Amino acid sequence: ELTLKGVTQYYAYVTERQKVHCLNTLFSRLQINQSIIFCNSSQRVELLAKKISQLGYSCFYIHAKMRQEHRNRVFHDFRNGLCRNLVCTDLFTRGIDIQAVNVVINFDFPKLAETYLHRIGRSGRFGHLGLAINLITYDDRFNLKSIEEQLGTEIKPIPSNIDKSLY
Amino acid sequence: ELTLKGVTQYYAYVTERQKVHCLNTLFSRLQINQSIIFCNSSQRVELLAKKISQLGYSCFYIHAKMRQEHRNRVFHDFRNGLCRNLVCTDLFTRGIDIQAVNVVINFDFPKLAETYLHRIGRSGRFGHLGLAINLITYDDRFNLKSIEEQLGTEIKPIPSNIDKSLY
Amino acid sequence: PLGSLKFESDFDFEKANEKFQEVLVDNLEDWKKERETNQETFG
Amino acid sequence: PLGSLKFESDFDFEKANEKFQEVLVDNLEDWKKERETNQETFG
Numbered sequence: 001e002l003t004l005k006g007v008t009q010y011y012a013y014v015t016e017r018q019k020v021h022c023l024n025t026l027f028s029r030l031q032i033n034q035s036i037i038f039c040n041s042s043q044r045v046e047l048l049a050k051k052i053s054q055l056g057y058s059c060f061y062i063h064a065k066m067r068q069e070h071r072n073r074v075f076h077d078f079r080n081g082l083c084r085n086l087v088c089t090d091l092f093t094r095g096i097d098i099q100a101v102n103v104v105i106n107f108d109f110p111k112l113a114e115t116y117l118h119r120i121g122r123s124g125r126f127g128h129l130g131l132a133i134n135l136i137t138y139d140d141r142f143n144l145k146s147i148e149e150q151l152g153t154e155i156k157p158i159p160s161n162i163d164k165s166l167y
Numbered sequence: 168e169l170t171l172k173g174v175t176q177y178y179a180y181v182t183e184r185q186k187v188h189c190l191n192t193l194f195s196r197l198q199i200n201q202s203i204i205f206c207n208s209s210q211r212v213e214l215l216a217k218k219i220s221q222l223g224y225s226c227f228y229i230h231a232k233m234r235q236e237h238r239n240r241v242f243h244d245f246r247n248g249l250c251r252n253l254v255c256t257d258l259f260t261r262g263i264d265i266q267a268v269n270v271v272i273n274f275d276f277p278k279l280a281e282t283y284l285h286r287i288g289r290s291g292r293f294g295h296l297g298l299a300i301n302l303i304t305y306d307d308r309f310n311l312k313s314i315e316e317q318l319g320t321e322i323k324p325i326p327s328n329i330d331k332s333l334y
Numbered sequence: 335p336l337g338s339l340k341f342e343s344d345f346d347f348e349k350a351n352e353k354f355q356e357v358l359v360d361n362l363e364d365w366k367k368e369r370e371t372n373q374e375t376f377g
Numbered sequence: 378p379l380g381s382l383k384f385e386s387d388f389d390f391e392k393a394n395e396k397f398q399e400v401l402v403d404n405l406e407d408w409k410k411e412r413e414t415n416q417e418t419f420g
Contacts (some may be wrong), residue, residue, distance in 0.1 A: 014345075017377075028363035044376075058249065066240075069236075070234065082228070100378055179393055216418075221380050224414055326390075
């Protein structure tokens, strides 16, 4: 199954208007090799890809309303590293297994702990060190603590300076 | 048909070993909004996409050995601007019509003037200003002058400082 | 085409965590909505 | 994975155009080859 062993998890309290601002601040301040950003719909995935490219960052995106061959080839190109950011929905049955992805960002926080695990979790006891940064809104405040409890982990507030040795 | 009205064309004499070095120097020195880089095979397109991503630049790539839907969606995403560089083969029947692509680079110079026109040419009398930079090898020296003659244009040596008002 | 989006200042994470603590202590004592939240996020 | 490729110095375009002029004035007076040129380009 999946565990959250090497994944240091943080949360940032935001409103929907502040999410793009928060993501750009994360991009600027954080030392990201590669990153995967999860959204709760394909529409929002495409809109966030547009916003990311506007801010000056290249972007990959995949979602459900796609031909599986296009999706697979885009995922292969992202694993090879042609672009450093990948925006996607929930279509990972297995845990992500890319050593270069040291930051995962839940742009839209999920409601079920199973989804949070499938986005953030790792396979085996020796996963690479990573960050998990959750953008939490008011309507997410209870699901945050509920998912934090169900999985027996802790999701701390994000500090203004994150230890570089964690990711 | 197609014309080369606003396109300022240059050539750089290179060997195959120097092509990636020359392309990185172009990326660093030139002020590129978006760029399309042509290669003579799909294998070389993928290898050049890898090299471009290694150098620190995001990359898109399309070629013939692809599903047409994947190709079309990648081209749509490139036109929307999610990534700033697109590596491709010769699969443009019509002239390219993207205002953001102010630099086109013939990584592999073609043999036929028709191919050079379909890569570099414009539709109508009011195309945006662009650059066309040809990587010329020893085996390209005669085709360079031949294509320059057949199309009634001039392909000058590349200067160490290019007028910013041309692209 | 492609716009160029820039934010003048940074997101204040300390202020955000403070707001969240205040929210918790104060709570202690379809397509229309999708389009609305999308307008708020990417407007 | 992803490597990080960096070139120490620049490509000398003036030197390249000089070499090309010299080439012109001196000329005045399958899969094996594909793999060879690919090894030269991306080796």
